[PDB]
Write a protein that binds this ligand. Structure first.
Ligand SMILES: [Cl-]
Ligand SMILES: [Cl-]
Ligand SMILES: [K+]
Ligand SMILES: [Mg+2]
Ligand SMILES: [Mg+2]
Ligand SMILES: [Mg+2]
Ligand SMILES: [Mg+2]
Ligand SMILES: [Mg+2]
Ligand SMILES: [Mg+2]
Ligand SMILES: [Mg+2]
Ligand SMILES: [Mg+2]
Ligand SMILES: [Mg+2]
Ligand SMILES: [Mg+2]
Ligand SMILES: [Mg+2]
Ligand code: NA
Ligand code: NA
Ligand code: NA
Ligand code: NA
Ligand code: NA
Ligand code: NA
Ligand code: NA
Ligand code: NA
Ligand code: NA
Ligand code: NA
Ligand code: NA
Ligand code: NA
Ligand code: NA
Lengths: 194, 56, 46, 81, 65
RNA sequence: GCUUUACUGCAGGCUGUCGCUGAG
RNA sequence: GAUACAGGGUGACAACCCCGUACUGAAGACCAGUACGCUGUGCGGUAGUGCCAGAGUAGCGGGGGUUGGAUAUCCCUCGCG
RNA sequence: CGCACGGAGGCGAAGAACCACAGAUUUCCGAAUGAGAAUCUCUAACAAUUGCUUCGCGCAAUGAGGAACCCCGAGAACUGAAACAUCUCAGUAUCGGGAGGAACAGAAAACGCAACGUGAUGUCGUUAGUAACCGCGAGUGAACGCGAUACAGCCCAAAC
């Protein structure tokens, strides 16, 4: 039979309808008064969190981060530039907002490592994402068969090197065939043309 | 007043001094910032790729 | 000017470094202080 | 661990202080206070220190002018070391 | 030279301390004679005194004082 | 470097529209 | 003399004056906590069953960047879904 | 008894010098962390940010460095086009963030010599200056496949 979790999932398919709509309209009022990174005891989307690796266990942390909506907050050129490079308004950053959110969270918890993250909506001027971070030094995690992998040295600052799920998709690594000629194995090894 | 020799006479102000962190006489005592190692501005050591030729 | 205790230690060291290569070092090495500094002609740090 | 007293500062001026003012001169550790100099001197030479004057010298060392009580004789204390 | 390692280990914790103060005093008196420009020195000892002191401190550390 | 009703663009201002955005 | 005629040193051109050199042997490090071996677990197959299987996603539209990617690259942003 | 061939003196058969491994000591400033300061000073200190928490800094983490290599972001212009705007130089220089001894990638919502075919991923050789782009100018420029190197395949979420 349907899991209870399937109901949370189904509700989030349409965040502008039903009970969820009323919930968001109420919550965001409190969220807009909260800071940039807020640690929360329980995930707003339990199903999504568990699906991404979350566990109600010691050393597993969740935090909601708000990031402004829109394009690059860019300064206009202050020296010679050909027309092509004179733009300001239409330039957008190459890292998606979700990834920015993930980095802001990881910076807040220097000892923790980003496991994954997901969206929890947006209003007219900002987006919110909840990031799942893990304590690679806590023994409750070092002994977990499903999570201990994140404790390895080569996983340090994984979010900053694009090793996150949002990092990998944003790097164009989703496809294994056509279209990934300049993305795999890395954008840098491919000359930065991905 | 000439901008050369006659203007060199008022130069008795101490600015750059021996830096606590790197030992170079670059710690600007007015700014409390070393122009050589970055002490006072950054925890990381001041360094730039342009301090050497590009392919080196 | 007003020198601090640390500045003073450094000035003291510079003065000591300003001595000559002892006579016996000449004999021992079978034959110059490249750091001879004059107060007027040269300039110390700080 | 560093010691307080380094060695006796023996110069013409130091002799005059010894002969005429019952004072002993020492090269002490620059981290040492007048009180620490007073104590160390009393314990090493078994005398009574009345006053200590200090100076950070242009040699990078600290000089202490230690005056002894009338009970003690600087010349005698110095003559035995 | 004159003071060997065996002799230091054979000493009791309290004997090493007393021996340390003794060596420190001989050193201080040698540095005093040196400061006075006094030549009745024997350069080997002032150097040996430093090593002997180091040895005693090393053994004091080895044996837990 | 400077100018302008030279060419081409880029900020900025004004204005419509969409999102934030809801009830009769 | 040579399984040693590489090289160097030595009061001038040295296989045989000295270090070495060939042969043989030893140790450490790396390979690697890997391979092999082992302990535990248990692979798989038939039939029935619409019980489960990752959403602002797949996909579409507006505006850009990027790419050899051209209608047919990858990515960002706003809206829809 | 360093470079370093002096003078004086000393050490070594109680086996020194010297070499290897291990240990002791290891001032002050320095990420620099009790606070301040041009290497000093003032009156107990994981400062700051975090995880756990006996909710007490009790147990832990981060910071900074490194020849380049590596990954993720920001991103010129001289120049070439015999001018120049798209294009080119070039995702280069330079800048911000960060890992390791190597990184990154990686067990197909692949390929599409279309097949009764291949079978994770890097890399090397080739495919090929081919296809594709481009004031269709100047220029730009892959991939599948193949021959090699090395080979390795698995864990969750959910159902119950
Ligand atoms: Cl991270
Ligand atoms: Cl094939
Ligand atoms: K140009
Ligand atoms: Mg690579
Ligand atoms: Mg001028
Ligand atoms: Mg002098
Ligand atoms: Mg005074
Ligand atoms: Mg381009
Ligand atoms: Mg401090
Ligand atoms: Mg041209
Ligand atoms: Mg032309
Ligand atoms: Mg190109
Ligand atoms: Mg292909
Ligand atoms: Mg399991
Ligand atoms: Na972190
Ligand atoms: Na001068
Ligand atoms: Na002295
Ligand atoms: Na001009
Ligand atoms: Na691209
Ligand atoms: Na779009
Ligand atoms: Na050491
Ligand atoms: Na710490
Ligand atoms: Na605490
Ligand atoms: Na030209
Ligand atoms: Na021109
Ligand atoms: Na073009
Ligand atoms: Na073939």
């Amino acid at each position: 039979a349907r899991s209870a979790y399937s109901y949370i999932r189904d509700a989030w398919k349409n965040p502008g309808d039903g009970q969820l709509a009323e919930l968001q309209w109420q919550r965001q009022q409190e969220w807009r008064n909260e800071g940039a990174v807020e640690r929360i005891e329980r995930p707003t989307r339990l199903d999504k969190a568990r699906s991404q690796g979350y566990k109600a266990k010691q050393g597993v942390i969740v935090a909601r981060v708000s990031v402004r909506k829109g394009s690059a907050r860019k300064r206009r050129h202050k020296a010679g530039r050909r027309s092509k490079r004179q733009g300001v308004t239409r330039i957008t950053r190459r890292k998606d907002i979700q990834r920015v959110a993930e980095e802001r969270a990881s910076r807040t918890f220097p000892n923790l490592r980003v496991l994954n993250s997901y969206s929890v909506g947006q209003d007219g001027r900002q987006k919110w994402h909840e990031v799942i971070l893990i304590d690679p030094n806590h023994p409750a995690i070092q002994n977990d068969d499903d999570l201990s992998w994140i404790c390895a040295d080569d996983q340090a600052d994984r979010v900053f090197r694009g090793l996150t799920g949002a990092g990998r998709r944003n790097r164009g690594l989703s496809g294994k065939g056509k279209g990934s000629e300049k993305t795999r194995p890395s954008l840098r090894s491919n000359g930065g043309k991905g | 007043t000439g901008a050369g020799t006659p203007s060199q006479g008022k130069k008795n102000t101490t600015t750059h001094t021996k830096c606590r962190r790197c030992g170079e006489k670059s710690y600007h005592t007015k700014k409390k910032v070393c122009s050589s190692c970055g002490f006072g501005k950054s925890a990381k050591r001041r360094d730039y790729e342009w301090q050497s030729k590009a392919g080196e | 000017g007003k020198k601090s205790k640390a500045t003073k230690k450094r000035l003291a060291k510079l003065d000591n470094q300003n001595s000559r290569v002892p006579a016996w070092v000449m004999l021992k090495t079978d034959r110059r202080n490249h750091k001879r500094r004059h107060w007027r002609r040269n300039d110390t740090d700080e | 661990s560093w010691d307080v007293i380094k060695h006796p500062h023996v110069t013409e001026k130091a002799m005059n202080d010894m002969d005429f003012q019952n004072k002993l001169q020492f090269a002490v550790d620059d981290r040492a206070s007048k009180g620490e100099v007073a104590d160390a001197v009393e314990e090493q030479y078994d005398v009574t220190v009345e006053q200590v004057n200090t100076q950070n010298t242009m040699d990078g060392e600290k000089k202490a002018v230690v005056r002894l009580s009338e009970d003690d004789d600087a010349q005698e204390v110095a003559s035995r070391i | 030279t004159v003071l060997h390692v065996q002799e230091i280990r054979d000493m009791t914790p309290a004997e090493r301390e007393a021996e340390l103060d003794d060596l420190k005093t001989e050193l201080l008196n040698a540095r005093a004679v040196q400061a006075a420009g006094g030549a009745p020195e024997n350069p080997g000892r002032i150097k040996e005194l430093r090593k002997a002191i180091a040895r005693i401190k090393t053994i004091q550390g080895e044996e837990g004082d």
